[PDB]
Amino acid sequence: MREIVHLQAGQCGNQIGAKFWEVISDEHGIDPTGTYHGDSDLQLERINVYYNEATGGKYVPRAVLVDLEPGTMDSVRSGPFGQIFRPDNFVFGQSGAGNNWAKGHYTEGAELVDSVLDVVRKEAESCDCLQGFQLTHSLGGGTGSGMGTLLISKIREEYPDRIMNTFSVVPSPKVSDTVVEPYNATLSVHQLVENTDETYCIDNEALYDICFRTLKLTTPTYGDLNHLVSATMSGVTTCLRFPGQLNADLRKLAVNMVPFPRLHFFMPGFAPLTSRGSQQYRALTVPELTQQMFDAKNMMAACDPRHGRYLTVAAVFRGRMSMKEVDEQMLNVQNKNSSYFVEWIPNNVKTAVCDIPPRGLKMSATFIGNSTAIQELFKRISEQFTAMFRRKAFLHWYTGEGMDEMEFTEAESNMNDLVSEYQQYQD
Amino acid sequence: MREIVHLQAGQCGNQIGAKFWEVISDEHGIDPTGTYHGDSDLQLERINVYYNEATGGKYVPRAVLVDLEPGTMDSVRSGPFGQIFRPDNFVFGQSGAGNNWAKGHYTEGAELVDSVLDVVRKEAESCDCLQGFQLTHSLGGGTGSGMGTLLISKIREEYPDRIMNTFSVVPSPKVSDTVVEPYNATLSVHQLVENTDETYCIDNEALYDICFRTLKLTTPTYGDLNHLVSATMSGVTTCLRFPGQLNADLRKLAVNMVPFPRLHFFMPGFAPLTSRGSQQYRALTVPELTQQMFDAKNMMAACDPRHGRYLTVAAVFRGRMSMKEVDEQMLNVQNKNSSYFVEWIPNNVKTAVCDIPPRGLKMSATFIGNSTAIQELFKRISEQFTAMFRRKAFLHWYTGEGMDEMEFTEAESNMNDLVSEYQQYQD
Amino acid sequence: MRECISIHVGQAGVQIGNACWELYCLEHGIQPDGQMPSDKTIGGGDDSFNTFFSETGAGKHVPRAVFVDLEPTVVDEVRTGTYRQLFHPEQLITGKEDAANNYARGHYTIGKEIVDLVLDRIRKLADLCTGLQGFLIFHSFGGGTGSGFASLLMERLSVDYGKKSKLEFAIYPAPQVSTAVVEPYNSILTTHTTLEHSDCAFMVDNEAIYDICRRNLDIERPTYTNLNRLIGQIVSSITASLRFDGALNVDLTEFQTNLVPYPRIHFPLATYAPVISAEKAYHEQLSVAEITNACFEPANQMVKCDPRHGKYMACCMLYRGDVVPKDVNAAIATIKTKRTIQFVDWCPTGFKVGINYQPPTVVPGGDLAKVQRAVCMLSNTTAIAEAWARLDHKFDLMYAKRAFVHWYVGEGMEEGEFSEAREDLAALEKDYEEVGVD
Amino acid sequence: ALCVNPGNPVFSCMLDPKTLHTATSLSKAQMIMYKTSASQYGAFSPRPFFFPCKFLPQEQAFTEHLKTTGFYQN
Amino acid sequence: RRQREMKQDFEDQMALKELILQAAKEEEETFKKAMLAKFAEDDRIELMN
Ligand SMILES: Nc1nc2c(ncn2[C@@H]2O[C@H](COP(=O)(O)OP(=O)(O)OP(=O)(O)O)[C@@H](O)[C@H]2O)c(=O)[nH]1
Ligand SMILES: Nc1nc2c(ncn2[C@@H]2O[C@H](COP(=O)(O)OP(=O)(O)OP(=O)(O)O)[C@@H](O)[C@H]2O)c(=O)[nH]1
Ligand SMILES: Nc1nc2c(ncn2[C@@H]2O[C@H](COP(=O)(O)OP(=O)(O)OP(=O)(O)O)[C@@H](O)[C@H]2O)c(=O)[nH]1
């Protein structure tokens, strides 16, 4: 059978994977202690896609936690699902990263890559045949970008035939906390575009606005945001574990989403988000879901593709649907905005329908998008990087770490190439 | 029927034997008083291999305790099972040891051999038909070396047709505590090779490392280390005492493990070693047992055979398993590292299946190997002996009791011959 | 005697095999256990089932079909379904890796090590059968798995068995709707590989099937099941000549000979006239007149072809039910006198009638009609080339900008085979107006 | 309570699933939460009603008595 | 009567195998129940010491 081993990278991914993993075990109905409460036959069957079974009715999550700071891990371990997480999967370093990419890429990573490779391979023979891997981390995270760029490089030569899914969050476009963050992201993306085959792009600012739009709760927690992205990431994973006529393999999907190799950055899309009163002012119908599915405000990833155009669109529908209601609506949206697609490809929509609704809600869906709205993203960081590199601010550290200006020169040159290629194909 | 009588010698083997013996009683379920609480027929059936039975359901061990220092024996006699051992079997001399090989080998042993040989021939007449003898002692232990080397010579002429099993521990390479120990080792291992047929090689440094590795409990007792080594000796003896289509005789194994006469030195190998959470985080499956069974970290005897190659490998498996999984796991390792055996012999594996699981766990195994990893051992002592023989340090003592440098010359010359002999047949 | 073996390739072709076999078990009264009641029909496996099932001396009906798929999901529910005990475990040929919509991956990467097992399946079926007129291959041009895998086997069954018929059924890709854009890639590859080996290819489109549902069946929200029964009823009718008899009996060999005029082009159209809702048949009446008008009406066909835009060559009507030649030949004579219907002057007659006295019957929990008079309409016209004319302008653009090529060339393939197809379709289309031009 | 931390951002479930089931007169009670698109193919039990009122099968016993052996020859 | 006899004994033989199969799965989980109980007591005996 074909399975997935997951990676918790960066200190955000510590919050990400923790929420993500409970979001899985819960809806399969396992108690926090780990003794599965046998209730659903299908989830009892397709639990093996992500978990192995230990003794005592306990499915071990096949994931790895990596970090450097014990306190974050101790909080995760002391959480409601630390007991379902494994001490051997807890691998860590004796150093404080300083939120330094180079230290996490050259200095601290050197003595930790060996152990994690030993750890990850031990699970590799434990399973038979993977589809690949997925990595929850941040492009703007210091230790995560330092670790992740190292690992994605190494996992590539060992298993160049698998799926290297990457799950990263983009920092706040307005205001980035880490001042050396543009340096970290620019270094990371240089290897990312060379190593990754897929990239999930998520931004916090849009998540906050969604609260202003539909949550309206004023004061949520960051964990609530993790709950949202885990739900979205759960939705794309429903395909593999769930039955029903929809083709689940990411490779059935990747060839359908990737026209050319340089296209790796993709944007999420989710289905009904509802405020207080509209919970009973909403008549759940495939159009009104579809209308809400394609709303500029229900966008959450980076920015409005209203600035640009649409390359490819793919939506997975979770619940008791049929082929028709999705059929005419695609014709409806086709005719609604036919010009805002690209004339390069007609029928650029690839639809899948999951007949198994989530636990409690019936009419749901997820959307993955590749539009011409990423130009704003890396052009933004282009002025930033050029501005700080114009007078090489915050540089004596990395030269002391052993880095040189040359490495950045091609790294921005690679990024500028992606600026043109996205522009050339569409414009 | 064919039985075994044990020998307990050296101030170390004074400790191990009790720990060994109490395990066997706990394995068989005899109370500390000695009145067997009959619960398993088979352990009732095949207790005759090692024990005689007194009046009133009391299994008397057929073991011989010998030493010079009373306080060790008094501690042993005051132990949980000293009442199970006989004052008849408590033989000792009227002198302190001083940790001198020759004092026990030439001076003190002379008036003590008569007693023990009478005792061991008394118990020999008590039993009908023997497989042979096993001796628990140390090679770096002064009293065990002197008496052991004496008795092995004596036991050879009286019964040269039995099993002369020997259980010795190698002192720590980093520090021997005893500074005269390399003299003690070189003298003993000289006498050992001609008289012995089996030798167990164990070093304590690996045991500390294993404690940090899987025991993880930081501060153990040396008795716990004894509980580890006793399990290794218990498993190799579970073959004889327990049913199942496993060929148990050491001769059945010896001709299988020993290609040529001078090969006496061997390494143990043990099966699942488990830490605090992994007891309920382990999917106990034959593949993962074999993985941990063939782990260079599971090495406990001397050092990693990675530096050399593998002459003979033999592992006995204990539990409710089948021929096919052990067969396929057998063929995996052949395909796994085909080049790391010797082209001298293919299919260098010997397998025996004990269908009787232990008390406390079901899936278990024991491994006995003869690899090319002993070169580092005696070559280490070679530089030790040469440097100390270079300026004859601490020699006036041994000249006092009646020894000469000439005995040292041939002992190391014999040692050098075995250095080459291991070298030629593999390299 | 009169028997065949059906082939269902790909998760696309699996449920239709279920539905038809579920349909097929009803008219024979096949209980879900696998045996009849105390009444006597069992023996050496020789009765109405012997053409379709193998109810051997053991007494269990064994369907003469093999279900081949590469994605174990869908086959795992159906083997846990209702009729799983009737299905032979490993005739449900399952796979562990998908073709990922890639025609070459389904033809090269994985098809090698399973076909020999499948070849082992067909020979065991070949020895037990007696006449084996041919095969019933159910597939799809836009096959995520059906496309690549069926291509290899249909080559291999041709080279060893080139003296029997091979009947091909496939859903034709929607003309303007595309669930995949690699669909033009594999479908054009399927055609050029099959035209020189496939005997008779029959196609259909779902959107027109849907249109019928809310035109006359009055269902604005159907499912697969309704569609599967319709095409299942279609194949049931063509197999009714084997199961029943009639005033005259016609076999697939007669169809093939009479349908295909010239080599290469072997692509007629299928139609079923008495498609109607329950209430309409209730207070209305069915007769040979109106159903023949319905069966020739330009909007009752399931393929996006305008008959007045083309010209007719082949006409085959299979009357299953209580009909009499008196009104039959009179009605079709009027159809010949019809001026709108433009047959080619090459064929004075192009009309193949098949009479069967058994009325088609309702299915439990079904949506079909209450049929006493039915026709299975097999016809071929020149109005079809526009589908491939739709395909090529779709293909030429996407080939010119070499979409997705890094994918296909990454797995060891090149453009020369793709170049082969474009002139082949060019060769195919140019024959179509050449046979069109009188 | 089969809730993660109920009232979570995405929709959640609280009611007991084992009572959410409906049956048909020709089928068994089935879990509405987990009704799949494929189980309809054999869901309903048959009635002797939706069966044709005529059966005219092809009987070939007299054929095989002379199929099993070669025809007469001079 | 050959066929009716051979067919009837079959499902009997069928009936025999799942009943020893269900006997197989019930006994293994009892040991699984036993081992977790032993894993329960070992934790609590670690508690007092
Ligand atoms: N865990 C967590 N991360 C957050 C949160 N809010 C923002 N983040 C960002 O998520 C990023 C990714 O974390 P890591 O990749 O582990 O960062 P790092 O390598 O440890 O170094 P830093 O990025 O400086 O924290 C961080 O850089 C934070 O800026 C939050 O609420 N929780
Ligand atoms: N009993 C015991 N022996 C140990 C331990 N650690 C190392 N040893 C060694 O085991 C050796 C064997 O003991 P004996 O053969 O009885 O020693 P001996 O002949 O009385 O003379 P010494 O070796 O000097 O003690 C000793 O030399 C110790 O160096 C331990 O923890 N317990
Ligand atoms: N024949 C058939 N076609 C279907 C069915 N359901 C949907 N379709 C249409 O037929 C196509 C199915 O082909 P594929 O997606 O290639 O299926 P496959 O080749 O077996 O491989 P997968 O992609 O893994 O399922 C889809 O494009 C649908 O538009 C079905 O049940 N049977």
Short mmCIF file of N, CA and C in Angstrom, two decimals, chain B residues 294 296 304-313 332-348 367 370-373 375 425-427:
data_model
loop_
_atom_site.label_atom_id
_atom_site.label_comp_id
_atom_site.label_asym_id
_atom_site.label_seq_id
_atom_site.Cartn_x
_atom_site.Cartn_y
_atom_site.Cartn_z
N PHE B 294 20.25 -7.31 14.33
CA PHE B 294 21.43 -6.95 13.56
C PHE B 294 21.67 -5.45 13.55
N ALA B 296 24.47 -2.59 14.89
CA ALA B 296 25.80 -2.39 15.46
C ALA B 296 25.72 -1.73 16.83
N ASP B 304 32.52 -3.00 17.52
CA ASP B 304 31.76 -3.13 16.29
C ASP B 304 32.51 -4.03 15.30
N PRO B 305 31.90 -5.12 14.83
CA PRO B 305 32.53 -5.91 13.76
C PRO B 305 32.56 -5.20 12.42
N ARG B 306 32.07 -3.96 12.35
CA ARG B 306 32.12 -3.18 11.11
C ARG B 306 33.54 -3.08 10.58
N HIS B 307 34.52 -2.97 11.49
CA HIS B 307 35.91 -2.83 11.07
C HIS B 307 36.41 -4.09 10.37
N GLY B 308 35.82 -5.24 10.66
CA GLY B 308 36.20 -6.47 10.00
C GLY B 308 35.06 -7.08 9.21
N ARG B 309 34.98 -8.41 9.19
CA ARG B 309 33.91 -9.12 8.51
C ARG B 309 33.41 -10.25 9.40
N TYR B 310 32.52 -11.07 8.85
CA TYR B 310 31.75 -12.04 9.63
C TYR B 310 32.13 -13.45 9.20
N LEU B 311 32.69 -14.23 10.12
CA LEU B 311 33.02 -15.62 9.83
C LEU B 311 31.80 -16.53 10.00
N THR B 312 31.29 -16.65 11.23
CA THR B 312 30.11 -17.45 11.50
C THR B 312 29.13 -16.64 12.32
N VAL B 313 27.86 -16.70 11.93
CA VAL B 313 26.78 -16.04 12.65
C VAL B 313 25.71 -17.07 12.95
N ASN B 332 17.17 -11.90 3.74
CA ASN B 332 17.33 -10.46 3.61
C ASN B 332 18.75 -10.03 3.96
N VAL B 333 19.29 -10.55 5.07
CA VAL B 333 20.61 -10.12 5.51
C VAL B 333 21.68 -10.57 4.52
N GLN B 334 21.50 -11.75 3.91
CA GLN B 334 22.41 -12.16 2.85
C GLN B 334 22.41 -11.14 1.71
N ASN B 335 21.22 -10.73 1.27
CA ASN B 335 21.14 -9.69 0.25
C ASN B 335 21.52 -8.33 0.81
N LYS B 336 21.28 -8.10 2.10
CA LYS B 336 21.58 -6.81 2.70
C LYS B 336 23.07 -6.51 2.63
N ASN B 337 23.89 -7.32 3.29
CA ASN B 337 25.35 -7.18 3.25
C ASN B 337 25.94 -8.52 2.80
N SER B 338 26.00 -8.71 1.48
CA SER B 338 26.63 -9.90 0.93
C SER B 338 28.15 -9.79 0.98
N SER B 339 28.67 -8.58 0.82
CA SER B 339 30.11 -8.37 0.77
C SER B 339 30.78 -8.38 2.14
N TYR B 340 30.01 -8.28 3.22
CA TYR B 340 30.62 -8.13 4.54
C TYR B 340 30.78 -9.46 5.26
N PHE B 341 30.36 -10.56 4.64
CA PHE B 341 30.82 -11.87 5.07
C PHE B 341 32.12 -12.21 4.34
N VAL B 342 32.59 -13.43 4.56
CA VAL B 342 33.79 -13.89 3.89
C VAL B 342 33.40 -14.76 2.70
N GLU B 343 34.14 -14.62 1.60
CA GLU B 343 33.96 -15.51 0.46
C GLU B 343 34.40 -16.93 0.79
N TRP B 344 35.08 -17.13 1.92
CA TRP B 344 35.46 -18.46 2.36
C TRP B 344 34.24 -19.36 2.50
N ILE B 345 33.21 -18.88 3.18
CA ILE B 345 32.00 -19.65 3.44
C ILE B 345 30.79 -18.79 3.10
N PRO B 346 29.88 -19.26 2.25
CA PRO B 346 28.57 -18.62 2.11
C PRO B 346 27.56 -19.29 3.04
N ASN B 347 26.42 -18.63 3.19
CA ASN B 347 25.34 -19.12 4.05
C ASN B 347 25.86 -19.43 5.45
N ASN B 348 26.56 -18.46 6.03
CA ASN B 348 27.25 -18.62 7.30
C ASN B 348 26.32 -18.50 8.50
N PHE B 367 21.69 -14.31 19.97
CA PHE B 367 22.62 -14.42 18.85
C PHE B 367 24.01 -14.75 19.35
N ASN B 370 30.74 -15.20 15.50
CA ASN B 370 32.20 -15.27 15.44
C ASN B 370 32.60 -14.39 14.26
N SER B 371 32.79 -13.11 14.53
CA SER B 371 33.18 -12.15 13.51
C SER B 371 34.64 -11.78 13.68
N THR B 372 35.15 -11.01 12.72
CA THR B 372 36.55 -10.60 12.73
C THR B 372 36.67 -9.21 13.35
N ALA B 373 36.38 -9.17 14.66
CA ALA B 373 36.42 -7.93 15.43
C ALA B 373 37.27 -8.07 16.68
N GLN B 375 40.62 -8.59 16.57
CA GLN B 375 41.97 -8.09 16.34
C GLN B 375 42.27 -6.88 17.21
N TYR B 425 43.47 -15.51 7.85
CA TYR B 425 42.33 -16.27 7.35
C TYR B 425 41.19 -15.35 6.93
N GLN B 426 41.23 -14.09 7.35
CA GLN B 426 40.26 -13.11 6.87
C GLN B 426 40.91 -12.11 5.91
N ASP B 427 42.09 -11.61 6.27
CA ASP B 427 42.81 -10.66 5.42
C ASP B 427 43.88 -11.38 4.61
#
